[PDB]
Amino acid sequence: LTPSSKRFQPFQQFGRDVSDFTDSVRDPKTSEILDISPCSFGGVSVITPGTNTSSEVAVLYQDVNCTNNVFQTQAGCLIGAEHVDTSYECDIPIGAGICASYHTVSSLRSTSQKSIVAYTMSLGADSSIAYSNNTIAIPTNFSISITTEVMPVSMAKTSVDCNMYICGDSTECAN
Amino acid sequence: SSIAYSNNTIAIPTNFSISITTEVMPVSMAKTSVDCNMYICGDSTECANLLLQYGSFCTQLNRALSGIAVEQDRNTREVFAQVKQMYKTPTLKDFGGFNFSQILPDPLKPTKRSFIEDLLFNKVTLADAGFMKQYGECLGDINARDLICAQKFNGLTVLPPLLTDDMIAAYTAALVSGTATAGWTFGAGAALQIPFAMQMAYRFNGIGVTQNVLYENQKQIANQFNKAISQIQESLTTTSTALGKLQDVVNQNAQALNTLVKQLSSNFGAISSVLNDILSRLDPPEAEVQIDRLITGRLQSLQTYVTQQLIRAAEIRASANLAATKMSECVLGQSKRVDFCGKGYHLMSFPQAAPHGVVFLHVTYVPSQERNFTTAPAICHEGKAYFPREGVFVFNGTSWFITQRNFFSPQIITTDNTFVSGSCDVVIGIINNTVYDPLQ
Amino acid sequence: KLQDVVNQNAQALNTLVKQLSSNFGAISSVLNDILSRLDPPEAEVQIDRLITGRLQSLQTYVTQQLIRAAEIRASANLAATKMSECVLGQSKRVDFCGKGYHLMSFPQAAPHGVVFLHVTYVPSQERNFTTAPAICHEGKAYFPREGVFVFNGTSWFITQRNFFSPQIITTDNTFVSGSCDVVIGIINNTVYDPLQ
Amino acid sequence: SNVLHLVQDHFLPFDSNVTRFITFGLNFDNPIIPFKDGIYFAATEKSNVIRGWVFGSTMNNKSQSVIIMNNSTNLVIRACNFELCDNPFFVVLKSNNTQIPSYIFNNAFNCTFEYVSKDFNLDLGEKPGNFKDLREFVFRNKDGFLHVYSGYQPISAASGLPTGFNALKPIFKLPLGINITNFRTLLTAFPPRPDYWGTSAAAYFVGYLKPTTFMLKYDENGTITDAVDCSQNPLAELKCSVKSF
Amino acid sequence: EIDKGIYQTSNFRVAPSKEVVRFPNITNLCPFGEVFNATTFPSVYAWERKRISNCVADYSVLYNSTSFSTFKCYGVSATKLNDLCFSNVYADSFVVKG
Ligand SMILES: *[C@@H]1O[C@H](CO)[C@@H](O[C@@H]2O[C@H](CO)[C@@H](O[C@@H]3O[C@H](CO)[C@@H](O)[C@H](O)[C@@H]3O)[C@H](O)[C@H]2NC(C)=O)[C@H](O)[C@H]1NC(C)=O
Ligand SMILES: *[C@@H]1O[C@H](CO)[C@@H](O[C@@H]2O[C@H](CO)[C@@H](O[C@@H]3O[C@H](CO)[C@@H](O)[C@H](O)[C@@H]3O)[C@H](O)[C@H]2NC(C)=O)[C@H](O)[C@H]1NC(C)=O
Ligand SMILES: *[C@@H]1O[C@H](CO)[C@@H](O[C@@H]2O[C@H](CO)[C@@H](O)[C@H](O)[C@H]2NC(C)=O)[C@H](O)[C@H]1NC(C)=O
Ligand SMILES: *[C@@H]1O[C@H](CO)[C@@H](O[C@@H]2O[C@H](CO)[C@@H](O)[C@H](O)[C@H]2NC(C)=O)[C@H](O)[C@H]1NC(C)=O
Ligand SMILES: *[C@@H]1O[C@H](CO)[C@@H](O[C@@H]2O[C@H](CO)[C@@H](O)[C@H](O)[C@H]2NC(C)=O)[C@H](O)[C@H]1NC(C)=O
Ligand SMILES: *[C@@H]1O[C@H](CO)[C@@H](O[C@@H]2O[C@H](CO)[C@@H](O)[C@H](O)[C@H]2NC(C)=O)[C@H](O)[C@H]1NC(C)=O
Ligand SMILES: *[C@@H]1O[C@H](CO)[C@@H](O[C@@H]2O[C@H](CO)[C@@H](O)[C@H](O)[C@H]2NC(C)=O)[C@H](O)[C@H]1NC(C)=O
Ligand SMILES: *[C@@H]1O[C@H](CO)[C@@H](O[C@@H]2O[C@H](CO)[C@@H](O)[C@H](O)[C@H]2NC(C)=O)[C@H](O)[C@H]1NC(C)=O
Ligand SMILES: *[C@@H]1O[C@H](CO)[C@@H](O[C@@H]2O[C@H](CO)[C@@H](O)[C@H](O)[C@H]2NC(C)=O)[C@H](O)[C@H]1NC(C)=O
Ligand SMILES: *[C@@H]1O[C@H](CO)[C@@H](O[C@@H]2O[C@H](CO)[C@@H](O)[C@H](O)[C@H]2NC(C)=O)[C@H](O)[C@H]1NC(C)=O
Ligand SMILES: *[C@@H]1O[C@H](CO)[C@@H](O)[C@H](O)[C@H]1NC(C)=O
Ligand SMILES: *[C@@H]1O[C@H](CO)[C@@H](O)[C@H](O)[C@H]1NC(C)=O
Ligand SMILES: *[C@@H]1O[C@H](CO)[C@@H](O)[C@H](O)[C@H]1NC(C)=O
Ligand SMILES: *[C@@H]1O[C@H](CO)[C@@H](O)[C@H](O)[C@H]1NC(C)=O
Ligand SMILES: *[C@@H]1O[C@H](CO)[C@@H](O)[C@H](O)[C@H]1NC(C)=O
Ligand SMILES: *[C@@H]1O[C@H](CO)[C@@H](O)[C@H](O)[C@H]1NC(C)=O
Ligand SMILES: *[C@@H]1O[C@H](CO)[C@@H](O)[C@H](O)[C@H]1NC(C)=O
Ligand SMILES: *[C@@H]1O[C@H](CO)[C@@H](O)[C@H](O)[C@H]1NC(C)=O
Ligand SMILES: *[C@@H]1O[C@H](CO)[C@@H](O)[C@H](O)[C@H]1NC(C)=O
Ligand SMILES: *[C@@H]1O[C@H](CO)[C@@H](O)[C@H](O)[C@H]1NC(C)=O
């Protein structure tokens, strides 16, 4: 319940939105209009390695500004993952350019324990090529490469018996 | 139009123009997820227990929506991440007189994206304007009935794309810089540096025009290239519906979520659509009949949303596959397919990042200023028939010559430009002329 | 990918089975209990609710199957196109059959799919070379015919772009057009004539 | 607030035929107008010539009737078995500008309902110029209740019903439980000379409500500012279908 | 068992901790004696309607004073009668035969 700027006519006591959800009400004892809002407004996701791999979990709250680790991403407030400045290939896509993985981090001494780490993913290898008005690169050798491409062609063909699925061996249900 | 036919008139273009056209292709669409309990029951424990007793098939719904979301991130990666190595933007952006300034990021500009890309992002108006909305923000913005707050209060969420807009523009800059420096070679294998003017000469050879046409007209072609880029820039600056295809995609996604919210005011054979009104007025036995009707109708509404989302994602997938094909065939190489990359003979293509899509600038060779000529299938020199080698015989109004079809460049008919087979009587339209021999 | 397909199919059936345990506003999902406990008039309501729910479940299954079949149809059309263009011929389309210049392709059967082995030509071990657009021999400009002018370091040659094979610049490897002043990066060199 | 609301009820259709009854000169219109399903009542007047109505079925003492007349002091709603006079009116002297007692009914018996409003002052004086005030009323009889919706607008029209839009707010829901098929307006009279009658310029308009679909528009403050008659024309039925103006 | 990845769980939920009951200020009891213990009742054709306002509808006082052979509610629940506030409530009185 919050204070509201809505004005209610003497003959009005409740107000509804486009969803017909009651969002405004005039308090009986004090004739003040109050706004009613839902208690649940969270976008929550859970990042986990394999269950057999570990039972540790990192939780992302999409709608929360962060102001153990509590790192703030553009996707949301991320809790339970260390932020590493190194850029790797994406392993678990958090979003907004942020990815997560399970990397061995020596937080204390040399523990050699694995933890969930969040990082900005690497787009690709960095390269520099020189341009001029009179240099050309001509290959002096070649290789024969063989690559694989896997393409689905068909899927399982299925049929359904209606009387069996809906009614089974029931004559009353069949009728 | 009317065109004349005869057995000996051929039209050979005497000039050409460099044309640059735009192709707008959707690539991805909004990734959405649904909270089953929030949409159907809200913050109601009585409804939640009835929804549990009721067969809840909305883990199937979220499974379908999650598959859509992963495909949307796949779509962008297949289109833009085809380059293996990121190529640094050249410090100088004028290769042989061809101005690449507009389609390359400006180091002084803070937006780290091309000038043309900035115009495209200004065209399409996005509804989300960010993927973070705090609880205090919507509470303080209750007076204005924000649609995003309304749908987020009902369990409808929009997930951010994995690749941020700056990352996609980074891929585009590497693609443009690689083409301007390494040409077509980096598309298939390691990048091989080649001068840009020679690259243009190679591409002119691909469409059947000799190299000398490019080099003798390098200043004219470069100027035509620069003016064509400017016309694209001017056309995008003025308001238009060129990017309507991308706008249509974002409109459909917002419309679907707003329809979902408005369907909560729907009765489905029940006394009221307000769950609190029913629960405040009836016993659990009598309210169970009404709540079950609201559960069934609201579940069907979510089923309809997901099914339409699946069909829409199929269309986006087909569009993104075409964009991924056009990136490999029109940008990373030269295409002989007719009308696949622009109108006219394809020279090169430049990708540009767009909101939820890609824009292709196709550079094409357009012949113009044709001239009519008298033509013969072959030449009878001395009892022997001479056929042209990669050309067509043209009278020119004075003496028979041989020229390439696309561009008119008369050449003396010699034994090098022609080959001899058979006799003179077999060919129908054969005429008599001399064939010059260099050794004579 | 192939595995994914089959997995979905299995899931699409198993879910169906589990949805038989679902009440849809009814007292129970067990038809036998309702039939053993109520008269036909009172059991009709519950049985109708169960019928509606199960029919909706079957509708959902068939719709999802239709969409998946459309996706499989698109994939199979692409596979047939690749069989026609990469296996039965040679493709000049970039990246349509493997990475690099396409040499050939070999099909292999796979469970509910096809695996294409694309044999391609990949250049390597490149070398930098001074190069010129044309050669000025005697007031005339010579442009290479299917090649590029390159500099070993001492003398000018003409070579194919993909593989380096230096050849003596002759009138057979080049063609003459125009004068020398028009070309920008034109340089001076001799053009060998076999006739002389 | 800030919504478009589609509702089906008994509404006065847009551009409907509306019969006019005037009081000026030698005609003092007091007919028995049928009530039908419901009526839209609008009075154009510069002086308080209109005082109320009498609703009933037989308009005599053989059946119950309700009178909503507004005398000079307060509003009186009286549902009784009335021996109604065939020509009921109030009387106010044109020069004296004072109200003297007048008869609407001879005798009232077996009465079932009574309501008296708070005391207020009403101006009985004749006024010059054009019509100054527009008072709009909707009367709906459903499930034993008489619903009254009222609205007021300042106008300057010399004749006819001015065009415009006005949302009437609910003022009364009278539990009468009477059969209503007819109604008669109660106007005041301005007799200059005894044994003779007179009239002051005033007009009222009667329109009949019908069950129709309307799309109401709510502004920020919750008021209704515009509406669309979805049955008026194919363009209007398009607007309601797409829920936009 | 869960494979590696990121999964969308339920939306963040807040469990209510306090109750807030707000009724208008009413100090009187409803005229149960005036309605159910009237000396005279009208005929069914001339049934009598009376308005009720500004009162607490505590029908537990009806116990031990009156006994109803018929009591049926429509549009509402009997067990819900104690937790509600009613608008425009009228009582119609008459006499019929069994
Ligand atoms: C093919 O068409 C193009 C037009 O697209 C022709 O280019 C035009 O060439 C003329 C003459 O060379 C140019 O006129 C010149 O204008 C400058 C001022 O800019 C003036 O100083 C010169 O004295 C001369 O009048 C014209 O500007 C130019 N147009 C463009 C757009 O470049 C080209 O000549 C045509 N080629 C053939 C073989 O017909
Ligand atoms: C307009 O109609 C109203 C309602 O009928 C009149 O108000 C009521 O008029 C009656 C009769 O004059 C009043 O009864 C009188 O009460 C006094 C004591 O207050 C008593 O001494 C008299 O013998 C008589 O019984 C009644 O009180 C009065 N009520 C109110 C609220 O004022 C009103 O007078 C009428 N005005 C006219 C004639 O324009
Ligand atoms: C009904 O009673 C409540 C409780 O007495 C009143 O609320 C209080 O009113 C006093 C005087 O206005 C204030 O000083 C208190 O701060 C109020 N407390 C609350 C609970 O807000 C309420 O005003 C009364 N309402 C009516 C209809 O008179
Ligand atoms: C979260 O809130 C903070 C403010 O509390 C926003 O800005 C940060 O403010 C602090 C303190 O002034 C600065 O030291 C930081 O540099 C600010 N920037 C960031 C990005 O941390 C912050 O922008 C908010 N984050 C979001 C995404 O809403
Ligand atoms: C390539 O095009 C850009 C844009 O037309 C040129 O940049 C402009 O240069 C002129 C002259 O210096 C300035 O007046 C403009 O303000 C510049 N515009 C921008 C956007 O920077 C650029 O000079 C061209 N490059 C070449 C050498 O052709
Ligand atoms: C091209 O030349 C040939 C031979 O010089 C011409 O063929 C001769 O035509 C004349 C005219 O009728 C005949 O009398 C000869 O018998 C032909 N000679 C042979 C070997 O057939 C031919 O007519 C010439 N074509 C043109 C168009 O002038
Ligand atoms: C320039 O190209 C020529 C031709 O390939 C190279 O000259 C050859 O060098 C080898 C080794 O000394 C000799 O055995 C051949 O007889 C030479 N051929 C000719 C035609 O002279 C030379 O190596 C190249 N220059 C550089 C710097 O690589
Ligand atoms: C290629 O040879 C030509 C002619 O042998 C050179 O052109 C001459 O250059 C000199 C030097 O300035 C001038 O004085 C002459 O007038 C030019 N002759 C003509 C006909 O224009 C040319 O410079 C040579 N190129 C190189 C790169 O050495
Ligand atoms: C009901 O109204 C009728 C008609 O006005 C009354 O009948 C009149 O009664 C008077 C005596 O009170 C006679 O002088 C008239 O001649 C009668 N007229 C007619 C047409 O019959 C009747 O008395 C009224 N009943 C009441 C007041 O209860
Ligand atoms: C709702 O009511 C408020 C308050 O009467 C209106 O705000 C006033 O509008 C008038 C006319 O524009 C201004 O002169 C006042 O200064 C405003 N006061 C305030 C508190 O801002 C508001 O315009 C009304 N809204 C609508 C659309 O009817
Ligand atoms: C999980 O990992 C452990 C250790 O490698 C292995 O023994 C176990 O079989 C794995 N289980 C699954 C679910 O793959
Ligand atoms: C080639 O580039 C260099 C460095 O910018 C410059 O000095 C030289 O003059 C250029 N030559 C040509 C052919 O433009
Ligand atoms: C070629 O011939 C056609 C048909 O007569 C004519 O329309 C066209 O203008 C001619 N073009 C030239 C350049 O002569
Ligand atoms: C072509 O025709 C023109 C005009 O008849 C003539 O001047 C020219 O010499 C002919 N030959 C060439 C060089 O194309
Ligand atoms: C072209 O057609 C005309 C009309 O039939 C004919 O006279 C002429 O000889 C033909 N020329 C050839 C054979 O090309
Ligand atoms: C060509 O030059 C570049 C530097 O500009 C260098 O990295 C590359 O290895 C050279 N290639 C060869 C082997 O000539
Ligand atoms: C005018 O009205 C007053 C008050 O009712 C009254 O006393 C007076 O006698 C009236 N005069 C006339 C003209 O009847
Ligand atoms: C109505 O009034 C008459 C007298 O005119 C009386 O005889 C009758 O009983 C009354 N009926 C009611 C319902 O009070
Ligand atoms: C009923 O309850 C009242 C108190 O409300 C008590 O005075 C009375 O004795 C009880 N028994 C009756 C009325 O028979
Ligand atoms: C009604 O009042 C009488 C007399 O006080 C009493 O005996 C009777 O029990 C009361 N009944 C009810 C319904 O309270």
Coordinates of all heavy atoms in Angstrom, one line a residue, chain D residues 12-18 229 232:
Chain D
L12 N -28.3 6.5 -25.1 CA -28.9 7.2 -26.2 C -28.0 7.2 -27.4 O -26.9 7.7 -27.3 CB -29.2 8.7 -25.7 CG -29.9 9.6 -26.8 CD1 -31.4 9.1 -27.0 CD2 -29.9 11.0 -26.3
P13 N -28.5 6.6 -28.5 CA -27.6 6.5 -29.7 C -27.3 7.8 -30.2 O -28.0 8.8 -30.2 CB -28.5 5.6 -30.6 CG -29.5 5.0 -29.8 CD -29.8 6.0 -28.7
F14 N -26.1 7.9 -30.8 CA -25.6 9.2 -31.4 C -26.4 9.6 -32.6 O -26.8 8.8 -33.4 CB -24.1 9.0 -31.8 CG -23.2 9.1 -30.7 CD1 -21.8 9.0 -30.9 CD2 -23.6 9.4 -29.4 CE1 -20.9 9.1 -29.8 CE2 -22.7 9.5 -28.3 CZ -21.4 9.3 -28.6
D15 N -26.7 10.9 -32.6 CA -27.5 11.5 -33.7 C -28.9 10.8 -33.8 O -29.4 10.5 -34.8 CB -26.8 11.4 -35.1 CG -25.7 12.4 -35.2 OD1 -26.0 13.6 -35.5 OD2 -24.5 12.1 -35.0
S16 N -29.5 10.6 -32.6 CA -30.9 10.1 -32.5 C -31.9 11.2 -32.6 O -31.7 12.3 -32.4 CB -31.1 9.3 -31.2 OG -30.4 8.1 -31.2
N17 N -33.1 10.8 -33.1 CA -34.2 11.7 -33.2 C -34.7 12.1 -31.8 O -34.9 11.2 -30.9 CB -35.4 11.1 -33.9 CG -35.3 11.5 -35.4 OD1 -34.3 11.5 -36.0 ND2 -36.5 11.7 -36.0
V18 N -34.8 13.4 -31.5 CA -35.2 13.8 -30.2 C -36.4 14.8 -30.4 O -36.2 15.8 -31.0 CB -34.0 14.5 -29.5 CG1 -34.5 15.2 -28.2 CG2 -32.9 13.5 -29.2
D229 N -20.0 5.5 -30.5 CA -21.2 4.6 -30.7 C -20.8 3.6 -31.7 O -20.8 3.9 -32.9 CB -22.4 5.5 -31.1 CG -23.7 4.7 -31.1 OD1 -23.6 3.4 -31.0 OD2 -24.7 5.3 -31.3
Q232 N -23.1 3.2 -34.8 CA -23.5 4.4 -35.5 C -23.3 4.2 -37.0 O -24.2 4.4 -37.9 CB -22.8 5.6 -35.0 CG -23.4 6.9 -35.6 CD -22.6 8.1 -35.1 OE1 -21.5 8.0 -34.6 NE2 -23.1 9.3 -35.4

